Amino acid sequence: AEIYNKDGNKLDLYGKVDGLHYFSSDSKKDGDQTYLRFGFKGETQINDMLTGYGQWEYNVQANNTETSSDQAWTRLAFAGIKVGDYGSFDYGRNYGVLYDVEGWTDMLPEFGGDSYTYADNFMAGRANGVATYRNSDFFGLVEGLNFALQYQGKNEGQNAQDINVGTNNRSSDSDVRFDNGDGFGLSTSYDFGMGISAAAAYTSSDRTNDQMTQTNARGDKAEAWTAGLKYDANDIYLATMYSETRNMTPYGNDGVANKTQNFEVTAQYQFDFGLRPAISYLQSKGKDLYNNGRYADKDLVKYMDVGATYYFNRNMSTYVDYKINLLDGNDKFYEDNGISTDNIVALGLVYQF
Amino acid sequence: AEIYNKDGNKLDLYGKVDGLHYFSSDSKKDGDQTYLRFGFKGETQINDMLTGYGQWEYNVQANNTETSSDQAWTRLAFAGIKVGDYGSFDYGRNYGVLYDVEGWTDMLPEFGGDSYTYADNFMAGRANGVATYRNSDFFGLVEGLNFALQYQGKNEGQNAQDINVGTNNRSSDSDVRFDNGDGFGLSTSYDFGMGISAAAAYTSSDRTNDQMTQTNARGDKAEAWTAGLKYDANDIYLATMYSETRNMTPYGNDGVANKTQNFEVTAQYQFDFGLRPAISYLQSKGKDLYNNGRYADKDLVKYMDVGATYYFNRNMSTYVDYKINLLDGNDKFYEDNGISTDNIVALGLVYQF
Amino acid sequence: AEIYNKDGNKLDLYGKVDGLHYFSSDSKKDGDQTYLRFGFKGETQINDMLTGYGQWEYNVQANNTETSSDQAWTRLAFAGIKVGDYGSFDYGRNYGVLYDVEGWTDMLPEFGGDSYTYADNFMAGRANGVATYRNSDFFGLVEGLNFALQYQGKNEGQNAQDINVGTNNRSSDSDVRFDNGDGFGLSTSYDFGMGISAAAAYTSSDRTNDQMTQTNARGDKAEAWTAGLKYDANDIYLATMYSETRNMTPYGNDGVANKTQNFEVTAQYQFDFGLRPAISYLQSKGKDLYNNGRYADKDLVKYMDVGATYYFNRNMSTYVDYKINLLDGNDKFYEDNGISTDNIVALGLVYQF
């Protein structure tokens, strides 16, 4: 929504209101889930080949009481500059380069995008303090090939004992799993012109001393790689992705997997009158999980999804999503770690601007 | 304040800033009370008989320090469809239908509207997970008759060690009084054309397992009913309302009343040059309150209010409100529950958009 | 950024997104420091000599995880009237008159403004519940002489013991150091026309009963005064200020200074091509610090800064700020009171609107 355009500067507001209800036997997911997003995007024309921009995206939950706490948080906040064809650079809270692939399959009515991607988890998704350089023609060598170089500085929690550990942006009571040391990321994507497109991403970062000592994943670095393909043409949206992670992905209340194998696939069709059904599959196979002095292999995430979204227009929509969780509810591992096994049904009515 | 109207979407930002001070010997309310509201109203034209809309209202306190917590919370957040004459349906955090009457007498400069209305109190006021269907002229057959059908799903907090209690949207350390089970609400109003209007509304809801056991109110449902009349014409506003509530409305630090009888009346005139006096009286008589193993009938809220508002224009106003509290300060009952005994004088200067 | 101007009502949205990083050996400062500001400025024309205005400024941190608490708070929120040329009166959360001087030297790239200025510290900076009368001609006596009269109501924390102590707007565990009683403020400024301007301010405030009893600053009133001069012409910006405070300025984890001597200077040049280096010095000499049952004189704040801001245009800028800290590193006073001694280097890229 363009609301300002004077003196070579543009400011657009954007957000949504999601009237959302969950039907699920898991009493931690069942119930009202109404939330909203508010934010702005502005961009200023410095000169004919230079532009500056900043972006804010805020999440505000509306399903708890006005006395409830911590119902609002920021998803994105970054500033950046784009030098025409030479590329762009941004810094702040932005998406991890790994998400350059995961976005292709993070396109379900309500659920999805969570086989291995978590917020504040190295560069798996949205991260604090990422410097991201991107370019749309790979240094002019290949038109249509996107490239990304990304670097994320340390976000380490302090210790009440010695005051020389950590960074400002992690409280002492931080969950150690969502901390990280410094790290870089690489990603690139291509559209072949036939509606078939490919992308891949690679990141590698150090893990904080406290992660090496207090988590049940052993090792000094967190690494990830992903590739994906999508077919987006003739009213069809097909997107699949495979990924692997080492000493990075969390699971349960207090677990890190030394290794994961992850797969997602989403198959969708777009009817001309507004209905968009979608069939999807998501899996995360944990590996070498250190439980009680011994290793074991368990599915951390595994569910099939069927659902549809109906678009009245670009500004209003409603949808249903059915998450059929295939994790074994009779495997005590899940309850023990607090990983839910139950199903969810989502009902959503969404205004956008 | 309409800021967007392009390609079939309309978006208005709205809110106010209230520079507000309270003068009172009750030390938990005396002092600065400055707050502001920010939010939006969005409406999109799907086609000639269909409209989508979304609404956000934010409450942001600005009367405490930049270090304080929980100074901001969401008042309203819903998405909806209006199908011409067939009516409207929306879901999310919206007003309860009991407020179809209470809004008539909650028309004071600053105070008011608090005989039986509490936020997050089933559908007494604003509630989570309420679906509200409204029809504004009975399908175009009868002018001036609005009716509303409303449904509110269960809002209950967990149990510390039982995984069978609660909702996603209520934590265990929530006050159980502002919890609720499923329930429906009905409301209707009619304006006979002479500036007098009559309305009544009725709600009945289940009470949660925790509500029946941890509070001082017994019963398996929480229900309330109310009727009111308003005369709104020729710079005169008289509105009174009567209500009854059973096993729902809270009082004091940790109390819910088995029965309340509540009445409010407001007499206001609007002068041509901008002065709007307000004569109002508000009372809620509690019944069968369980204090220490014995029943009691005591006044929960009882005061007379006088005040005036001066409107500079549609965007600026200032006011003084005098709440003269009629509850007996020497009755040890009140301080025991933390129920106010003191008078309040409010002076506020309000910028609006 | 003007987004509304209809029927004598204007609404401007304003704020910035700062991609900010600090490099510092202090683990309470090192890391990502990315934040954003959001707010509006509204003005309506009541009539030919009357204007209403409201303003909100919000700070939102985006440097901690979506799980973090208290990443957002209000810096400013006030409503007011301007009687044309006769001056202005506004109330709410606004700046203390002392900052009418401090703002001149609080103009460094990143750092600065912290010799003695802290938020919610009587009228040193932003405060709750300030009523401010302003005049652009000193009651008609002297054209060009700005005058300010300001009154701040009691901001006193409640007591769990006596429930008639304190104000509504100070929470259970509130720090009494940032509390305050009643107090008045006076301020004035003049532009001599050759680029030299002078300003001075004086405030005196009562302190709360608990402030006299629970803090290491002895006395029953908190007082401060400041004067400063600036040269702002010929691409040179020179500003200095000297200030003194009594029983008001805080320091460290649990400290109040019985007296402070404060000096700031910032020297800046603005090149025509957009670079603006700035060299500055800031000191606050603490005096009569009752730290361990004994009085002491310590530098509370003392550092030099060198840095530059580069302005792409009115909407985008990037900068570097190098703060060289002069405090005595081998002094147990600092660690014992928790005042950091280390340097910080900041790198920032800023979008503004």
Numbering used by the authors:
A (entry chain C), B (entry chain B), C (entry chain A): 1 to 353
Tell me what the authors wrote about this structure, in their words.
The porins OmpK35 and OmpK36 belong to the Porin_1 (PF00267) group of bacterial outer membrane proteins. Both OmpK35 and OmpK36 form trimers composed of 16-stranded β-barrels integrated into the outer membrane, and the crystal structures of two of these proteins showed polar residues lining the internal pores. Structural and biophysical data agree that polar molecules of less than 600 Da in size would permeate the channels formed by OmpK35 and OmpK36 with limited selectivity. A fourth porin in Klebsiella, OmpK37, is also a member of this family.
We solved the structure of OmpK37 by X-ray crystallography, providing a structural map at 2.6-Å resolution to better understand the relationship of OmpK37 and OmpK38 to the major porins. Like the other porins, OmpK37 assembles into a trimer, with each monomeric unit composed of 16 β-strands that cross the outer membrane to form a β-barrel. All sequence variation seen within and between OmpK36 and OmpK37 trimers maps to the extracellular loops of the β-barrels and residues lining the upper reaches of the pore. Analysis of the structure also illustrates an important feature of the β-barrel porins in terms of the solute channels that they form: no clear path can be seen through the pore, due to the channel being particularly constrained in the central region of the protein. This impediment is dominated by the inward folding of extracellular loop 3 into the β-barrel lumen, to form a “constriction zone”. In this loop 3, OmpK37 carries a bulky residue (Tyr118) not found in OmpK36, a residue that was previously speculated to lead to a decreased pore diameter. However, the crystal structure of OmpK37 dismisses this conjecture as the tyrosine side chain is oriented toward the pore exit such that it does not contribute to the constriction zone. All other residues of the constriction zone in OmpK37 (Arg37, Arg75, Arg126, Lys16, Asp106, and Glu110) are conserved and adopt the same conformation as in OmpK35 and OmpK36. PhoE porins have a constriction zone radius comparable to OmpK36, while OmpK37 is in between the OmpK35 and OmpK36 pores. Our results show a lower permeability to some antibiotics (ertapenem, cefotaxime, and ceftazidime), but the structure of OmpK37 reported here demonstrates that the pore diameters do not differ and could not determine drug specificity.
